[PDB]
């Protein structure tokens, strides 16, 4: 009976006295945690060992029994430093003991503190556990209460105030609860023996350790290794977790502004795109315009005006990979697609369902297609709606839904389908032996102007900050050029759907300078670059 008091006294004196140099680090941490309504304490094992090794020995022998005592000691200290009501505090641990590989845990480790690491592969939803709980006695209508703690309980049968064999029920109207969550840990990929599928474990956490990690992240874990009921005399193992380890600044935008006022920025950005590829100036310019894009607009009568850009390319393999790397968001695919959804979408079967291809998935970003001619039959017709409307709509087999397809498409191949694109060009080649020799020398080196990341961040900044408008002079220029070309064709087609593309190219060109208005300088370069032919 007295041992429960001495241990609590010992941990209470541990928190109140541990200085390293001049700061009571744990008194300060426990005060600073309460002010932000965080009821927990993060103790370090090495400091506990340094203070008194006997306390660590007791903790190491019987963790399941001794952890609650230290927690209630934390509560007793927490009340003194902040009151002249609080819940029970959560203890959290850090350690540097030798990691056990997940594959080696066995019957020798049951009810021991264990440190391991792996990859999280799944996460459950949150669930409720009880800590303080009230009880009603059915016969006499007497009432009492119980305090649960979550370490390895059932309702009692010692009736009070005969009173009967099993008279107790719960008043949920006057009880307290906490959160709980389940996780799955899979062993590290570079530790598995050859020819075997990786092994995994299941584990639990509660209160502040919940909702701290997501699937696919590599983590390190400290926790008690134990068993639970779910052959003969055989039980399942698991782990109780006690600890886990896993927009612009001003100085950034100053650099981007300095770039914006450079008189030769357009040349600089074109030169920075696929520098190994020789020639093909207008291709690089068109890719800059594709990356930057126009400006979206919405009108009083509800009509909606597109912002995206679309380009086709008729060597060519490299540029799509570069566009994938430089773009803020990017998807890469070949014409047949990743599944039966193809590029756009399809219905599959047993009840029917629907899944989207690599036009729905790239919504909000860029998508590049490696061979546009290998497009499937359904996608040939569906890309019309995917490009013009930026939507995909299906009414089949009782399904009736519409999907968003807001993206800019880059494509390459080697007909009427060319009408959907804003610009079309044909790739050109040159055959200097020095170029091939340089490439070969670089290949042997691995076998034996603006950088990508800076350019990507700059593109993000320009997309976020500016959305320019046409000046009146540009309007007069464009309308005169439009009627001029149509008259020239008449005496010898251009249509409104291409004028509205020239406008988007003009806005994208004005976007680089961060000029709020587009000007005749941009209109001239726009119509100059319009010569797809």
């Amino acid at each position: 009976d007295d041992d429960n008091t001495e241990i609590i006294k010992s941990f209470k004196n541990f928190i109140l006295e541990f200085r390293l140099d001049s700061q009571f680090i744990y008194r300060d941490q426990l005060r600073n945690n309460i002010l932000v309504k965080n009821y927990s304490l993060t103790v370090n094992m090495e400091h506990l060992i340094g203070y008194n090794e006997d306390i660590y020995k007791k903790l190491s022998d019987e963790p399941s029994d001794i952890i609650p005592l230290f927690e209630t000691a934390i509560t007793q200290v927490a009340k003194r430093i902040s009151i002249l009501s609080l819940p029970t505090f959560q203890l959290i641990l850090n350690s540097n003991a030798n990691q056990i590989p997940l594959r080696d845990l066995d019957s020798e480790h049951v009810s021991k503190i264990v440190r391991l690491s792996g990859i999280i592969i799944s996460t459950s939803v949150l669930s409720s556990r009880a800590t303080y709980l009230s009880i009603m006695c059915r016969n006499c209508r007497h009432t009492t209460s119980i305090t649960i703690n979550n370490f390895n309980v059932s309702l009692p049968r010692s009736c009070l105030s005969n009173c009967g064999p099993d008279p107790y029920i719960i008043i949920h109207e006057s009880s307290k609860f906490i959160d709980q969550q389940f996780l799955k840990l899979q062993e590290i990929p570079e530790l598995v023996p050859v020819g075997e599928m990786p092994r995994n474990l299941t584990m639990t956490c509660d209160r502040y350790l919940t909702n701290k990690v997501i699937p696919g992240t590599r983590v390190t874990i400290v926790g008690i290794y134990s068993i639970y009921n779910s052959g003969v005399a055989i039980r399942t193992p698991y782990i109780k977790i006690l600890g886990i380890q896993s927009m612009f600044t001003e100085e950034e935008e100053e650099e981007f502004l300095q770039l914006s006022r450079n008189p030769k920025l357009y040349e600089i950005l074109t030169n920075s795109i696929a520098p190994s590829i020789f020639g093909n100036e207008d291709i690089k310019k068109a890719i800059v315009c594709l990356l930057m894009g126009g400006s979206k607009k919405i009108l009083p009568d509800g009509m909606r005006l597109r912002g995206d850009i679309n380009v086709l390319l008729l060597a060519k393999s490299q540029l799509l990979k570069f566009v994938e790397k430089v773009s803020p968001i990017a998807v890469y695919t070949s014409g047949k697609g990743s599944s039966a959804a193809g590029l756009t979408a399809s219905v599959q079967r047993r009840e029917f369902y629907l899944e989207g291809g690599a036009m729905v998935l790239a919504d909000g970003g860029v998508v590049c297609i490696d061979e546009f001619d290998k497009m499937r039959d359904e996608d040939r017709v569906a890309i019309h709606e995917a490009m013009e409307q930026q939507t995909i709509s299906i009414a089949k087999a009782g399904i009736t839904t519409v999907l968003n397809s807001r993206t800019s498409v880059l494509a390459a191949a080697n007909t009427t389908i060319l009408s959907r694109f804003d610009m079309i060009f044909i790739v050109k080649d040159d055959h200097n032996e020095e170029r091939d020799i340089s490439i070969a020398n670089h290949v042997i080196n691995i076998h034996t102007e603006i950088s990508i990341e800076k350019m990507k961040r700059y593109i993000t900044y320009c997309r976020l900050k500016c959305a320019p408008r046409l000046s009146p002079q540009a309007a007069e220029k464009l309308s005169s050029n439009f009627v001029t070309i149509r008259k020239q064709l008449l005496i010898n087609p251009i249509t409104i759907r291409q004028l509205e593309a020239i406008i988007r190219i003009t806005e994208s060109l004005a976007k680089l300078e961060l000029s709020p208005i587009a000007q005749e300088r941009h209109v001239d370069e726009a119509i100059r670059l319009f010569q797809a032919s």
Binding site: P189, E196, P215, H431, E433, D436, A440, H447, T448
Partner: protein
Amino acid sequence: ALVLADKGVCLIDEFDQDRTSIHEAMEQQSISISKAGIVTTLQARCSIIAAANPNGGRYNSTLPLAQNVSLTEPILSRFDILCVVRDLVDEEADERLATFVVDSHVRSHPELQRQRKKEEEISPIPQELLMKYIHYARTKIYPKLHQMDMDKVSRVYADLRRESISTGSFPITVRHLESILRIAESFAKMRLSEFVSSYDLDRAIKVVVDSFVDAQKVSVRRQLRRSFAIYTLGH
């Protein structure tokens, strides 16, 4: 089944989802999958040897490789060595084959010295020693390139690209160069040599260039072999 092939050899004797799995397998060296919220990864890390029947009953030599297969271009691009084997007509070859076949058939009949004579006539190396040798070489030997002759390799690569473009052939690529260097390392490993040598590069160049030539149409084949004589036969 690629998990079971980890650091081993994968064998395919005949041939959409299977091909899709093989596309991902050749593109990567690791396999990844997700299901009902779960996410996980696996390793393939293996050599793939495959065989196929050329689009029905018989191969057509007048046409390029793509006409004779049910494969996408990246498959042919990413494999190191490609080859076609055909039942050619020759009286002497037929006689040699028939004599060897009946001789082996008699040699296998159910009805120590006999075994030793049989074994030593069968092969020049005892295959137990060869298997141990292969295991030893795979575990111990890790060759490296020598930097002198690589200037010549770059010049040969540029020349091959120029000649390919000149006749209008599909061009040679960095994949072919990488395959040449890797095959040269394999030749060095086969004799337990930690150094690649000029003859290794020559043999690798011959293998890859001949494989590249076999994929082409007949007129392109004739032009290539007439120009490439200083590689396929000479060096």
